[PDB]
């Protein structure tokens, strides 16, 4: 490891554990697999590390002794997912660190763990599953004893409009200056990803709110030019979040959900019923006023 034969050393420990499991303790088989996983990050074979993790389960961390190992495992799985750039997964491993009995009780120890969650949850694509996860976070009071994390997360739990050159500037001397969020190295190339998140969140808002809008107007909002804006709507119609139709000459982009004849009329039946309940209760309070005066 110290030598240049670091690369040979990874292949050695790795091959071994396929056959061997011995008459070893629980604590030792896991101890060897954690070691093996690290080596394969260093060697740069991330796929090998993926194979390695699944031999032990997460039914072998229920015991309090194995918490030091539970934590080391949950930390490792993060570095793996970070390389393949799937942030949904990263946050969920970190969520379980926070849910650790050890981590939770100590003041100092919840602070970075929670902070780290917030950054990778937002960076995940914005879908239906995203919705329920970022609002669980929002409800916690640990987060409200901080203000730095709270300002970023708050933006995507509302369904307001927001614009990239503004969001970029706000957090530039806060969290772009904290590494393992934005502005690190690999994280310098994730500051560039933050752009996509803002747009894809905006399109949710805009579809619901505008039933019809000009495209020429749309490219301002998202802070894009025409080429970018069409691509991002097309992908997003396929994903199932929104349903839309986009016109290529440079006319109008209509966001809509299909509504049949029968459906529109059903709403119109319910209006009518509800109006007649309104009028009956009104007659009762008039009768009632005669008693008052």
């Amino acid at each position: 490891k110290e030598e240049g034969k670091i690369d040979e050393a990874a292949d050695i420990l790795c091959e071994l554990q396929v056959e061997t499991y011995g008459s070893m303790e629980m604590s030792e088989k896991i101890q060897f697999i954690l070691e093996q996983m690290e080596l394969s990050i260093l060697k740069g074979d991330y796929s090998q590390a993926t194979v390695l993790s699944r031999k032990i389960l997460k039914k072998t961390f229920k015991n309090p002794k194995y918490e030091s190992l539970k934590l080391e495992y949950y930390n490792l799985l993060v570095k793996i997912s970070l390389h393949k750039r799937e942030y949904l997964e990263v946050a969920q491993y970190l969520q379980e660190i926070y849910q650790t009995d050890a981590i939770k009780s100590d003041e100092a120890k919840w602070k970075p763990v929670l902070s780290h969650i917030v950054y990778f949850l937002v960076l995940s694509p914005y879908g239906n599953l995203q919705n329920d996860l970022i609002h669980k976070i929002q409800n916690d009071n640990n987060l409200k004893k901080l203000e730095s994390q709270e300002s970023l997360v708050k933006l995507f739990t509302t369904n307001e409009l927001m614009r990239w050159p503004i969001v970029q500037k706000t957090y530039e001397p806060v969290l772009n200056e904290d590494d393992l969020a934005f502005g690190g190295e690999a994280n310098k190339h994730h500051w560039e990803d933050l752009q996509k998140r803002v747009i894809e969140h905006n399109l949710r808002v805009i579809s619901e709110y505008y039933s019809r809008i000009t495209l020429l107007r749309l490219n301002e909002l998202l802070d894009l030019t025409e080429s970018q804006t069409e691509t991002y709507i097309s992908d997003l119609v396929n994903q199932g979040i929104i349903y839309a139709k986009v016109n290529r000459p440079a006319k109008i982009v209509n966001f809509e959900k299909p509504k049949n004849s029968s459906q529109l009329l059903n709403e119109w039946s319910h209006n009518v019923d509800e109006l007649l309940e309104h009028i009956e209760t009104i007659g009762h309070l008039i009768t009632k006023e005669e008693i008052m005066h």
């Binding site: 004849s261 009028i279 008693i291």
Partner: protein
């Protein structure tokens, strides 16, 4: 079951009611069926009173629920229900009004058991004027239903006049209800209407 109650003619604030009587009545009826407990007291109407508020508070001792005041009208007025129902509830209000005891209307419905309903059907044999049966009968209901609404709306119009010139009280519950009517009002000449015509051709 009846309680002996003698109600005065000099005032409405003066009444005799036997507390000792109520328990004896309850324990005998407990023997019959033991799912019966005090849930209020009936007034024979004809109309609501504010001396009933003081009586409500007395029945609140017995109850483990909030007393139902069931104005059972004995005058059979109106073609609809002869029951309006109310429960005494406590509120503050936006006016500057403290600790108010006041009665909020409850919608009235009727249900009957299987044995009870078929008792009615044995007694009566009438076809009713509010039934929705054959072509003729529904033709009658349709005209009757419409004229029903017409009567209630006309009252509202003359009630509005009576706030604003004859100084009846202004109340946010009454105004608030009318706002809702206007906001959820249907509209024609919309694409909703064009579709209604199309549905109309199919029928």
């Amino acid at each position: 079951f009846a309680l002996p109650f003698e109600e005065d003619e000099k005032n409405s604030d003066v009444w005799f009611l036997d507390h000792n009587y109520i328990e004896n009545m309850n324990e005998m009826c407990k023997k019959i069926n033991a799912k019966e407990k005090l849930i209020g007291w009936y007034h024979s109407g004809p109309k609501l009173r504010a001396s009933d508020l003081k009586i409500n508070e007395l029945f609140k001792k017995y109850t483990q629920n909030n007393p139902l005041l069931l104005i059972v009208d004995v005058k059979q007025q109106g073609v609809g229900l002869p029951t309006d129902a109310y429960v005494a509830i406590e509120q503050v209000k936006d006016d500057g009004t403290s600790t108010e005891k006041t009665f909020l209307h409850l919608p009235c419905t009727i249900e009957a058991e299987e044995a009870e309903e078929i008792g009615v059907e044995h007694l009566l044999r009438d076809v009713r004027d509010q039934a929705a049966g054959g072509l003729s009968i529904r033709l009658t209901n349709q005209l009757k239903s419409l004229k029903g609404l017409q009567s209630k709306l006309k009252d509202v119009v003359e009630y509005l006049d009576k706030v604003i010139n004859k100084e009846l009280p202004i109340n946010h519950t009454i105004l608030g209800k009318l706002q809702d009517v206007f906001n959820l009002l249907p509209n024609l000449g919309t694409p909703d209407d064009d579709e209604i015509d199309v549905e109309n051709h199919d029928r």
